[PDB]
Amino acid sequence: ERKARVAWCGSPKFLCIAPGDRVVVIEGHHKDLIGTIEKLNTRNMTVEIQ
Amino acid sequence: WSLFGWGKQKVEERNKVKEELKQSELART
Amino acid sequence: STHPTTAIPKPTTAVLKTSPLAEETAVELKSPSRLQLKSEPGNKGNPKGHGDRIWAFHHIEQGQVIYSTKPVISHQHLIRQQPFTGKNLVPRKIRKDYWRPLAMIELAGKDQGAVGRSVYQKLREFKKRHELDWANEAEEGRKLMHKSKRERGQELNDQKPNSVADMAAVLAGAGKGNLMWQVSRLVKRQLRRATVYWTNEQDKFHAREWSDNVSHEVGIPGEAEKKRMPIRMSS
Amino acid sequence: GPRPTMSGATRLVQKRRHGFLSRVKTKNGQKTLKRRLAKGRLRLSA
Amino acid sequence: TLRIDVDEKTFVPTLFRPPAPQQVLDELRNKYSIFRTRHTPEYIAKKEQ
Amino acid sequence: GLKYRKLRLTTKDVNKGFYKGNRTGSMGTHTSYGTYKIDYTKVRTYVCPDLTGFKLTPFVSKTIRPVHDQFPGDKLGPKNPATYLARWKSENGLD
Amino acid sequence: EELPPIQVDENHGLWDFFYDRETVAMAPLEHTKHGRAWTVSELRKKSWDDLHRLWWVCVKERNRIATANWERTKSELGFGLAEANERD
Amino acid sequence: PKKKTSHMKKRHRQMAGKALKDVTHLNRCPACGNLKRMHHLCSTCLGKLKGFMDRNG
Amino acid sequence: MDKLLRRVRMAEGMVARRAQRKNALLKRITERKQNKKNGEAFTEAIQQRK
Amino acid sequence: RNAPFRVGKKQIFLPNHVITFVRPLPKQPPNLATFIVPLEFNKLDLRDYLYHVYNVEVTGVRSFVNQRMHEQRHGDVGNWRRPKSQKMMIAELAKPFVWPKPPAEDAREAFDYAMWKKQKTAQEQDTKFQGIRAQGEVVPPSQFEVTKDRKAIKARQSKFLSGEETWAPGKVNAFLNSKI
RNA sequence: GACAUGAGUAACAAAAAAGAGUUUAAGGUACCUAAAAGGUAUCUUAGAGUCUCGCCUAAAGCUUAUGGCUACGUCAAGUAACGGCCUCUAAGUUUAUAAUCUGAAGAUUAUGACGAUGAGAAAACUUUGGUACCAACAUUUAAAAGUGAAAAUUGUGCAGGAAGGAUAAACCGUACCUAGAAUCUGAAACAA
RNA sequence: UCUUACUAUAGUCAGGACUAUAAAGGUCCGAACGGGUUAUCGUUGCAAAGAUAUCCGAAGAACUAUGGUAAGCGAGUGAA
RNA sequence: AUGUAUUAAGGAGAGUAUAACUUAAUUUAUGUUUAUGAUAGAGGUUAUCAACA
Ligand SMILES: [K+]
Ligand SMILES: [Mg+2]
Ligand SMILES: [Mg+2]
Ligand SMILES: [Mg+2]
Ligand SMILES: [Mg+2]
Ligand SMILES: [Mg+2]
Ligand SMILES: [Mg+2]
Ligand SMILES: [Mg+2]
Ligand SMILES: [Mg+2]
Ligand SMILES: [Mg+2]
Ligand SMILES: [Mg+2]
Ligand SMILES: [Mg+2]
Ligand SMILES: [Mg+2]
Ligand SMILES: [Mg+2]
Ligand SMILES: [Mg+2]
Ligand SMILES: [Mg+2]
Ligand SMILES: [Mg+2]
Ligand SMILES: [Mg+2]
Ligand SMILES: [Mg+2]
Ligand SMILES: [Mg+2]
Ligand SMILES: [Mg+2]
Ligand SMILES: [Mg+2]
Ligand SMILES: [Mg+2]
Ligand SMILES: [Mg+2]
Ligand SMILES: [Mg+2]
Ligand SMILES: [Zn+2]
């Protein structure tokens, strides 16, 4: 599952997304929402947008 | 935040979870 | 039958207030005894040297105390001085790794053994009234009556603090007819000199006050030979 | 019917009768260990 | 530890005496282990015998 | 005779001559009288040096980032006996 | 529990088992204030006298950690075990 | 038993006259006004009066 | 010695085979305990959807 | 340089042992120091270790072994085994040593005793609830500790009944586009 | 495998036995009070104790074993006030040695080794064969007396009563339970 | 590790009575202990062999403890 | 289950960073290729953001 969560941004051990990047949500209720990444958890491959 | 994954952490990690709840309480006012 | 006392204030024969319940001090509840009005009583019917020294041994873990006339104790002292305080609380024997000398009382007179046999009697009688008839600790102090029969028995075994207080009392004149007094009957009376040797200087502070006729020293003869160094406070 | 044959039993007899040394030092005991070893037993004796 | 003490060099190789007391080598590795690969010439000689 | 019997026998479970040590090591020999004579050639001592004035601690500041040694073109870099000998001639040739 | 306390020598060898002479254990915030372990490359530049002395400095440190872990639980002081496992 | 008891006959034995009878012998305490049993003392005022006579007497 | 090397290679293989048997078992015990813990979050999302 | 005892000859330069100094028992004299030592330690080893490492002279040593309960490898699953035993040693010191008294619950804030006490209470309740279930029993609804959700529904109950608040239908139960 | 029936039935009867107060912790209700809190009373769960009464008592008591799915802060150079380990051997055992016998396996004799339920210096300081022997039974003996052991003395009866060796303090055990009130064996919290 | 026999090392048998003995008896009455005569109870029992009373032996061919030996082609052990 | 290839002594106890395994229980180095791979940053515990040999 970890390899699938980052299939669009490389590999879990070669990750091309870092905290401080502005991303856009493409799923869920809050689609098209643009925000800035605050922290990035590499164990579950999740991201926090404050 | 699990009951068992709460003591196996450091006060550094535990104090940041308390800070997150503090800023959340200020936003509600 | 048995007759238990009550924790009420009473007078004392000693020159000190051995207990906060003591009303008066140095009270004569009975005329002097045959040997009390004697400058130098002697061991008339006892071995040579018997009575000049009195030893006290204690359990360094539980606090059980034993008084002896010789520098060693035997299985008799345990059977005849230790009452039943509960199951698994009375040891079946004396274990050398747990019993150590607590103190040794030495009288100035090196041939007045009768004085020591009396001090020994008052000490064993006081201890009997501590294990039994402990009305002064039921609702006050340790509050033995507020405890369980298990904790209560464990606290009745800890007779070390009580024993030290008995010494300060017996050596100060406590007890009716104890030979630590010396009545002249010209009537002037005084206390006899004594010396208490301690393995732990701190243990002598269980007594709130000591008499003026007793001198304190550290180290019991025979312990230094066993490689047992005494405990001092000032270091 | 079954009987209480383990009443008064001692563990010194268990080691002598079913212990490890009782088997490695005998011809028939070696077979027992090798049979139990083939089956995968953790407890080979006693 | 202070940086000045971490970078301080104090080791100088020796040839006629071991880097440490020979008794220390028995605490670093097990002398009777079945994984020992460095043996003495006498031990190898006895094995060949 | 049930589950407890199947556990490994320990010295706290039985008496009557069941002795089992804890690999402390033989510090002497037994006598025929039932006593023990200690052989101080078997007794072990702990050689602790003097730590007065020692500036090293078990930690290094994290400002000094960890770095491994480099031995280009040398397969047995840190285990090279030639480097140990060549480094010996230059630094200490006497001993 | 009310006797005059004895005067314990200040330079007693057993004081080396304690971090603080009042609380046997050290506060977690101060127990984490430590660097990193030595690297083999950094130890290759030390003599036997240093590695012999440094070894025992690590032994007494470990004994100090184990002593704090035991009191922190017996006396129920609170947290600090996770901070000590990293230091150890 | 020779046969298994049917659902009809076991319900008869369990329900016909085995209904729990409602307690209607109730009245109010004259000191507090709480519901109590007839010819019985108030359990609330009992304990309170039992304790009132323990402090001041 | 040639016969002493075979002694070490054989021993290295026995311990490696033992570790793999224990590791394989431990990986399955932790995967079962973790999947069961994640099931608590699945059960919640399923209860809320119904 | 002369120890009070006779030193051995087998020198140990890099020992890997961990010695733990534990608090004494209440009624123990101040000349007894208890340590948790390796199960392979012996009385002679403690005497040498304390003197050459900590400079502590001892007149005697006592040793006793503490056994561990037999357990299953995985708690409730696996073969039955027994962990290694623990060895404690009580040294008779030449100089007394007294331990400090544990801080008061009000002074343990440097260890976050407040948060630690809340977590401990929750763990105690969890083991108590499991014990009640292990007895084949359950906590009746009459004995459930009323939680904050229960205290909030009782307060509103008094407001609607008293007339302070007028009840109205829900508005956030479901987000329908019809809104009817 | 799940769930019915009997059935909310039997059973919770070792012919010891209970009664009335007090109290701790946590929690649940009602009232006081609406500033939370606290107080008063009551109930649930888990305990403790006082007075009275009864039962056991050459036990259902105390101290310890065999043993233990009870629990791990149980601490010893030795004697007084301790066992193991260690020395010595019995009954026996032996994939030890030698010889011999033997379809193989193996067996036998000798020696060695191992093997307690036995024997092992000293200490309230300590390190030949009746000139006999320590099986049974009886008798006598630590001198104020009595009683119970230890060891020894003497004798009796026939059933005629081991072996061997000698003569500055490590390691292991030490907690709790002893079966009428929570622990051993009886499938178990069993009137055995 | 039950049980039968044997074997080694040990232990136990209140008190009283008769008999030639102070002690010589498969002697007597009777506890502990060991048996299991008779009756009742129990029979999904407290118990896959128990309870109560009654009864028998109780210095012996006795009882008991810790070990050891002998059993499954041929039969080990057997006061049978 | 069969087939193919390779190999030719197996287990247990206790301990340990609970993916990491032996009291050193996450050792130390070499070479090559690294998104046209293989099949111009951050990150040494906030770790092991590298695979092969
Ligand atoms: K043959
Ligand atoms: Mg005991
Ligand atoms: Mg049968
Ligand atoms: Mg038997
Ligand atoms: Mg090593
Ligand atoms: Mg190697
Ligand atoms: Mg035991
Ligand atoms: Mg036992
Ligand atoms: Mg033996
Ligand atoms: Mg011991
Ligand atoms: Mg019916
Ligand atoms: Mg009926
Ligand atoms: Mg009924
Ligand atoms: Mg309440
Ligand atoms: Mg001993
Ligand atoms: Mg032998
Ligand atoms: Mg024996
Ligand atoms: Mg009974
Ligand atoms: Mg049972
Ligand atoms: Mg029973
Ligand atoms: Mg048998
Ligand atoms: Mg007869
Ligand atoms: Mg019937
Ligand atoms: Mg007859
Ligand atoms: Mg008879
Ligand atoms: Zn009322």
CSV table of C-alpha atoms (C1' of nucleotides) in Angstrom, one decimal, chain A residues 19 38-43, chain B residues 8-14 16, chain F residues 62, chain G residues 32-35 82-83 85-87, chain M residues 17 42-49:
chain,number,residue,atom,x,y,z
A,19,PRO,CA,7.0,19.5,3.2
A,38,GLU,CA,3.1,21.2,7.0
A,39,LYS,CA,4.4,17.7,7.8
A,40,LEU,CA,4.9,14.5,6.0
A,41,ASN,CA,4.7,11.0,7.6
A,42,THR,CA,6.7,8.4,5.6
A,43,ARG,CA,5.6,5.4,7.6
B,8,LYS,CA,6.0,4.4,25.0
B,9,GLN,CA,6.5,7.9,23.5
B,10,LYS,CA,8.8,10.7,24.7
B,11,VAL,CA,7.6,13.9,26.4
B,12,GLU,CA,8.7,15.7,23.2
B,13,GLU,CA,6.2,13.7,21.1
B,14,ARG,CA,3.6,13.8,23.9
B,16,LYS,CA,3.4,18.3,20.8
F,62,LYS,CA,25.4,15.9,16.9
G,32,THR,CA,17.5,13.4,26.4
G,33,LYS,CA,20.1,16.3,26.3
G,34,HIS,CA,22.9,14.1,25.0
G,35,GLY,CA,24.8,13.7,21.7
G,82,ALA,CA,11.5,6.0,26.4
G,83,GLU,CA,14.0,8.8,26.8
G,85,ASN,CA,16.1,3.6,26.1
G,86,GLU,CA,17.6,5.9,23.5
G,87,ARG,CA,20.3,7.1,25.9
M,17,A,C1',16.3,-2.3,19.1
M,42,A,C1',15.6,17.2,3.5
M,43,G,C1',16.8,13.2,6.6
M,44,G,C1',22.4,9.4,11.8
M,45,U,C1',16.8,7.6,16.0
M,46,U,C1',12.4,13.0,13.3
M,47,A,C1',17.6,7.1,11.7
M,48,U,C1',18.4,2.7,8.5
M,49,C,C1',14.9,8.1,1.3
